Curated annotation (Swiss-Prot):
Part of the whole protein covered: 48 to 69 of 158
Protein name: Kalata-B3/B6
Protein purpose: Probably participates in a plant defense mechanism. Has hemolytic activity.
Family according to the record: Belongs to the cyclotide family. Moebius subfamily.
UniProt superkingdom: Eukaryota
Domain writeup: The presence of a 'disulfide through disulfide knot' structurally defines this protein as a knottin.
Free-text description of this protein's post-translational modifications in UniProt: Kalata-B3 and kalata-B6 are cyclic peptides.
Organism: Oldenlandia affinis
Length: 22
């Protein structure tokens, strides 16, 4: 995206992925 549609995306996925990796 263009940060305004990519940064927040990576931020939300970061949490979900961290809480759904094991």
């Amino acid at each position: 995206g263009v940060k305004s549609s990519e940064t927040t995306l990576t931020m939300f996925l970061k949490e979900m992925q961290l809480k759904g990796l094991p």
